[PDB]
Amino acid sequence: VVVDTGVTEDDRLRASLLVQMLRYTVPFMVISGLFWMIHTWILDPLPN
Amino acid sequence: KIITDNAQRYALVNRGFAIGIKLLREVFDAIALNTPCIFLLEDIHAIGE
């Protein structure tokens, strides 16, 4: 009998990938908020 | 959104001074601040004879 688990290396690598995305999510949201504040202000204001 | 107003409410004159005829340009340049909009103005012959 071959005893097994369900944690083959692929899901571990995918978990580390998810952790990396979680690490990056905050600065990207900061820069996006900045860009959209600027674009809403000057680069695309109301017509009048 | 829609803005409606009548013209008779601005044909008010006294002493040969038409008060409402600049009230109208004031409401016009206020319409110009709430885009996009439809501005209704009925019975314009009251100020267009």
Pairing type for strands B2-6 and B17-18 reads: unpaired
Resolution attained, angstroms: 2.8
Amino acid at B16: G
Q: Return the residue of A nearest to B34 by Cα.
A: A48
- State whether residue B21 sits within 8 Å of chain A by CB: no
Q: Which residues in chain A have Cβ-Cβ distances shorter than 8 Å to B35?
A: 46-48
Read out DSSP for B26-48? HHHHHHTTS-S-EEEEE-GGGG-
**Separation between Cα atoms, residue A31 and residue A27, nearest integer Å:** 6
Experimental method: cryo-EM
Map chain A to HEC letters.
CCCCCCCCHHHHHHHHHHHHHHHHHHHHHHHHHHHHHHHHHHHCCCCC
Are B32 and A46 a contacting pair at CB < 8 A?
A: no
- State whether residue B32 sits within 8 Å of chain A by CB: yes
